[PDB]
């Protein structure tokens, strides 16, 4: 199916307190598989999924030096951005960077990504054609002209077209038992009285992977989406996710309400009811 | 696999 690989980077400066904090993470789909933290005693890229631990030492060295080098480049970029935006060296500022690739069900490239944010606002982003840039302001256009002169886009396009896809396919085969075997949600419905006239029907979806899921309440085959308290999908903490949707139903009408669960791990969309 | 690139602003 459709899959993705992503690398996230965050550099936060702390002037006078020392070096900026640097944290980078890698994700295949909704699975964290690598991390690097500058505040960690181990100044190296760490494995975060079991299927990446079969990678040899040469791999873990390369990813560590790249992460360290990204920490140093961000350090320099933050000082450069103070100059472009004419800011004092006293404030604390944030530099974020995201890059990666989507692949379709055939394993070919869907979309390539590389974008940078300064203090939460877009700075410069590679376009979809992998051959041009979108700059947010004149400060970012300074960087753009330099990156155009240094042919930054040609390397990113080669990586996004080649190494990014080929190594995402490699990860997908090595971790197929989890990355391509969706975890179905364990589901149940709870009943919580409010008054002597009304109660809450809360539909639960637990332990499912990936995070994409649809919880919908229906009263006699009619969508109650307008009056559904739906919570944002949240991590359980063991690589799976949780979600629930609630509706306020009149006392004695519970059986008229049905919770429908759609998920790629389900061989059939569930239809749950209040079961006392 | 991370990209190897040094592209200062």
């Amino acid at each position, epitope marked *: 199916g459709s899959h993705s690989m992503r690398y996230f980077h965050t550099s936060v400066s702390r002037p006078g307190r020392g070096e900026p904090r640097f944290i980078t993470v890698g994700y295949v789909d909704d699975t964290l598989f690598v991390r690097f933290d500058s505040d960690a005693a181990s100044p190296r890229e760490e494995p975060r999924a079991p299927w990446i631990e079969q990678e040899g030492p040469e791999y873990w060295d390369r990813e560590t030096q790249i992460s360290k080098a990204k920490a140093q480049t961000d350090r320099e970029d933050l000082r450069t951005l103070l100059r472009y935006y004419n800011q004092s060296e006293a404030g604390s500022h944030t530099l974020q960077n995201m890059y990666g690739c989507d692949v379709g069900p055939d394993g070919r490239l869907l979309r390539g990504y590389h974008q940078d944010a300064y203090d939460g606002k877009d700075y410069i982003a590679l376009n979809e054609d992998l051959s041009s840039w979108t700059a947010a302001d004149t400060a970012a256009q300074i960087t753009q002209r330099k990156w155009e*002169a240094a042919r930054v886009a040609e390397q990113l396009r080669a990586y996004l*077209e080649g190494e990014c896809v080929e190594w995402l396919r490699r990860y997908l085969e090595n971790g197929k038992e989890t990355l391509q075997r969706a975890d179905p949600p364990k589901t149940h419905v709870t009943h919580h009285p409010i008054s002597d006239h009304e109660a809450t029907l809360r539909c639960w979806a637990l332990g499912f992977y990936p995070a994409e899921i649809t919880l919908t309440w229906q009263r006699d085959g009619e969508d109650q989406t307008q009056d559904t308290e739906l919570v944002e999908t949240r991590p359980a903490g063991d690589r799976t996710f949780q979600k629930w949707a609630a509706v306020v139903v009149p006392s004695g009408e519970e059986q008229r309400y049905t919770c429908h669960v759609q998920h790629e791990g389900l061989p059939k969309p569930l239809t749950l009811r209040w079961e006392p | 696999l991370r990209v190897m690139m040094l592209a200062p602003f």
Partner: T-cell receptor, first 114, second 116 residues
Framework: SGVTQTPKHLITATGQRVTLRCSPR?????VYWYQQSLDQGLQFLIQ???????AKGNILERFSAQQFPDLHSELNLSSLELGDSALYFC?????????????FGPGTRLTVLE | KQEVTQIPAALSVPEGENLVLNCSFT??????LQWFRQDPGKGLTSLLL?????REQTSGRLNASLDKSSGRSTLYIAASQPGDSATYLC???????????????FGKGTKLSVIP
């Protein structure tokens, strides 16, 4: 505009000191020094960027370098030995990009004799 | 630990015949690979630059290929002209000792002679 180096040639005695000058191309803020001996080939010595030392190779502590405000660079080779006889090249790039080209000067051929 | 090797150390090709120059390196983690031309009296000139993730680069009669997995590169010169006589150097840009550092590592080169 290209990288310029002076002097073109240098013949001096052991234990002496020499200074090699380099003017990078217009717009290039980083300078690089290389030593091309017969025994080791082209070897990276030191890299400066906008006056500040950025990268360093297996340069000896008796070899000193500097990048000045005008971006031109000097390489001081002191306590000269016979092994220091080599062709010393100067390079320069626009910045510190991993994606672009370093441009080289014609080099300074140094001969050290007993 | 990065070391570049070129075979052969010298080569003599008949004028007009295509040629190939080989290169190999020890560390697959590189930023770019370059092919240089060094002329006695003159300096060094970069002929081609292959990005870290590219496979080939072409400039006129020149075609270079990069294979980081095997750590090898090949420079193909078509229709060798007497002006191609020079020492061809293989360079890789790869990280140094410091974080964010990089440096060109050079092979000893291949002295090419195009006998007319």
């Amino acid at each position: 505009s290209g990288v310029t180096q002076t002097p073109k040639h240098l013949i001096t005695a052991t234990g002496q000191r020499v200074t090699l000058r380099c003017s990078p191309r217009s717009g290039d803020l980083s300078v690089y020094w290389y030593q091309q001996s017969l025994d080791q080939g082209l070897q990276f010595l030191i890299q400066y960027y906008n006056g500040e030392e950025r990268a360093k190779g297996n340069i000896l502590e008796r070899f000193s370098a500097q990048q000045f405000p005008d971006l031109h660079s000097e390489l001081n080779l002191s306590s000269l030995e016979l092994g220091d006889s080599a062709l010393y090249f100067c390079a320069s790039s626009v910045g510190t990009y991993s994606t672009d080209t370093q441009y080289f000067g014609p080099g300074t051929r140094l001969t050290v004799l007993e | 630990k990065q070391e570049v090797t070129q075979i052969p150390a010298a080569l003599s090709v008949p004028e007009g015949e295509n040629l190939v120059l080989n290169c190999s390196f020890t560390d697959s983690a590189i930023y770019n690979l370059q092919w240089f031309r060094q002329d006695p009296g003159k300096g060094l000139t970069s002929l081609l630059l292959i990005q870290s993730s590219q496979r080939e680069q072409t400039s006129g009669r020149l075609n270079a290929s990069l294979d980081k997995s095997s750590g090898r590169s090949t420079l193909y010169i078509a229709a060798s002209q007497p002006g191609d006589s020079a020492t061809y150097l293989c360079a890789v840009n790869s990280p140094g000792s410091g974080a964010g550092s990089y440096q060109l590592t050079f092979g000893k080169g291949t002295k090419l002679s195009v006998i007319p």
